[PDB]
Design a binder for this molecule. Structure first.
Ligand code: PLS
Ligand code: PLS
Lengths: 418, 418
């Protein structure tokens, strides 16, 4: 008798909906740039009895009895994070990227202090100063964007904004930026205006880990990330720093500053995911992720689409939809209609509201995990192009649905499960 | 081939430490009052592919494609929460109790506003105004305590403190309070000083759900809880309110106010746990939890120990350790030494610091889940009494270890697993 057998017996409603979600993951092209398919091993840790343990504090410094094994697991997670990212300090307890970022803010700032991040419409995150997020509600958020000419960062301009605004904290790292970030230049800029420097590498963490993107850790005061995007782990957050005394302060801000008990089953999954990312296979995967994203971006360009910045250095791209006279909201719907899962996104200098947008964000990590190569991603580009160019055409619609089905059949997902 | 097989094959280190943690849970008396043993069904949801989905927003109002099944699951969680607690609104996304409470604060307060909760040393939570927590760092926290005479709440005195202090938010609900809370009197007090009223029922949520403790939902502005203590679910948080317009505001404060993507695998587990708590078996379990706690408290009293307040109405108790000339820190260690897992706790008006304390907190939920009855809890009381009364006696130590082993053998934990 298995845990899944108990679920079927005791909650057939939830059991059935879970089976539908597995079918759904199998039978769609998952192109949301922040998604991935985590391993069977990771999922086993999340399904474990580790959920039952209260473990406030840190390994060997807990507020409860009985943490001897939890301490061993969390210490493996910490040690593998420090190995993977070349970091002197790591806190593996943040429940999410949002909570990792909040703990950093609690450490470095007081309410009302000024933060400077990327414009949300240009690729910055809600937690980097959106007025609907605590980061913009309780702090004074100012923004930099990309160049209207190159559609990428102009470091001279960023320095000019920093000098004018005098932020206490500068944030780099983004949700929708397709080029390499120069952390050395961010350090120069922070040093010049006396700001703290945070790199939020949630999206690119697996590329950092694999050596396919420069590492912010030696240069920044602190680095946050999620564990579940290109790092292909469970959902959760992570705080890294080159400064182990500062790391002690961040620990206090995670607990007792912002969280209670950590999710030790998730932390076991973080350990597992970090161990997988230490393997040579993961370096190859991460190279393939970028090759695949570039292939999809190039083929979209071949089909007449504008890619913001003219291409990509990483796992993602923004498709500007003027060439096809669609809003992001419309394009997102139209691709959902042919079993492609993405999300809309504002482009730099978007004429439309964020609830409408002019862009579609696409990424390669999830389908790269299923085994697709560059020519398979060129085929994905062609399916998307076909659908967006001929949105009223029913025969194109069904061709797209059939081409998606072929890709999904070729590249099974979790074939041992039902 | 199973997910656990993949874990063993790919990460024997983590696999082995996980197996040790299962053995540990089996072979200790787990008396931490905030712990439980969640079901195989719940653990199956946590181990599922639902970890792979980004689902910012709410059911049918998401910021990503592909949430059709996630929406069905989260809507089941919501509907079962509203059923179980008789609530007009529920948000099942908070990652933790701390995050549920923070989202409420973001909705109702601004930094600097005054909050009033139970003194931490008297049983209040870190998130109810500790100076080491955001709740006391960024808000003005004032406290009420219990009567030095009765060691329980004196509602006239609470009204006097509220009138003097004029808090914007009053918090009731506690981490270490062993008596019934009168939510009607808290409403009277809040109405009289024009304060919002939050009930944080994390500890007692399963007793509320089963009708063995009065329900705060009809009386309070908002109710927070965790899902993992007496509710016996996965680790996470929950926001309930009688006011569905207010509920919409709390939703915005969870996302995008304080969190990003929800943990949909955990949310599936919340649905399952709520479904289990709707069953008559859970009513019986919750009655047994209180009978068992009372049995342990009574037998400790028979062995000469002071129980704060003179007994318990719920799942927990605080043992005052003056009768045995020990600190909480010492008592906690001494019981760990005989395979009993608890935690130290300050008593009301404790002469010692919170890092030392004069108290041991004990609770019945976890061992009640394993099947123990009242006479078994009287035996637990006798083992603890023996150890604390004779801390230097090696023969008593081994008798205690052997008596713990007998209890654990009689009442197997998750016997289908290895
Ligand atoms: C009333 C209340 N509200 C909130 C929380 C926080 O829950 P979290 O651990 O899920 O953040 C707790 C946790 N309670 C833990 C201590 O943090 C305990 O062992 O008692 C609580 O007791
Ligand atoms: C840079 C950065 N930092 C933090 C977070 C928050 O992570 P969480 O969802 O775990 O809170 C995100 C999430 N990113 C989501 C949107 O929230 C996405 O689909 O892009 C992020 O991109």
């Amino acid at each position: 008798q298995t845990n899944l057998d108990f679920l079927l017996q005791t909650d057939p409603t939830i059991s059935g909906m879970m089976q539908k979600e597995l079918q759904r993951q199998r039978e769609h092209l998952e192109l949301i740039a922040s998604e991935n398919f985590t391993s069977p091993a990771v999922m086993a840790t999340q399904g474990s009895v580790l959920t039952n343990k209260y473990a406030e504090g840190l390994p060997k410094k807990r507020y409860y009895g009985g943490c001897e094994f939890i301490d061993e697991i969390e210490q493996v997670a910490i040690d593998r994070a420090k190995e993977l990212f070349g970091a002197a300090s790591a806190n593996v307890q943040p429940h999410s990227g949002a909570q990792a970022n909040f703990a950093v803010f609690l450490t470095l700032l007081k309410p009302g202090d000024k933060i400077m991040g990327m414009d949300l419409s240009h690729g910055g995150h809600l937690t980097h100063g959106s007025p609907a997020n605590v980061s913009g509600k309780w702090f004074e958020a100012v923004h930099y964007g990309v160049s209207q000419e190159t559609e990428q960062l102009d470091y001279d301009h960023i320095l000019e904004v920093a000098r004018q605004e005098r932020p206490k904290l500068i944030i780099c790292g983004y949700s929708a930026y397709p080029r390499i970030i120069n952390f050395e230049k961010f350090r120069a800029i922070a040093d010049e205006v006396g700001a703290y420097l945070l790199a939020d590498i949630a999206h690119i963490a697996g590329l950092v880990a694999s050596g396919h993107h420069p590492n912010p850790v030696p240069h920044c005061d602190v680095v946050t990330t999620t564990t579940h995007k290109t790092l292909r782990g469970p959902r959760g957050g992570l705080i890294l720093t080159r400064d182990p005394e500062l790391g002690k302060k961040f620990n206090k801000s995670v607990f007792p500053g912002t969280q209670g008990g950590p999710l030790e089953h998730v932390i076991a999954g973080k350990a597992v995911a970090f161990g997988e990312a230490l393997k040579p296979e993961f370096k190859a995967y991460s190279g393939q992720v970028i090759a695949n994203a570039q292939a999809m971006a190039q083929q979209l360009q071949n089909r007449g689409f504008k890619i913001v910045s003219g291409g990509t250095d990483n796992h993602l791209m923004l498709v500007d939809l003027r060439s096809v006279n669609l809003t992001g909201k419309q394009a997102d719907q139209l691709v959902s209609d042919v079993n492609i899962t993405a999300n809309k996104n504002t482009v730099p200098f978007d004429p439309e509201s964020p609830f409408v947008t002019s862009g579609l964000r696409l990424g390669s990590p999830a389908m790269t995990t299923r085994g697709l190569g560059t020519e398979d991603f060129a085929e994905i580009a062609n399916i998307i192009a076909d659908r967006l160019q001929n949105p009223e055409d029913e025969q194109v619609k069904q061709a797209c649905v059939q081409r998606v089905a072929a890709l999904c059949e070729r590249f099974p997902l979790y074939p041992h499960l039902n």
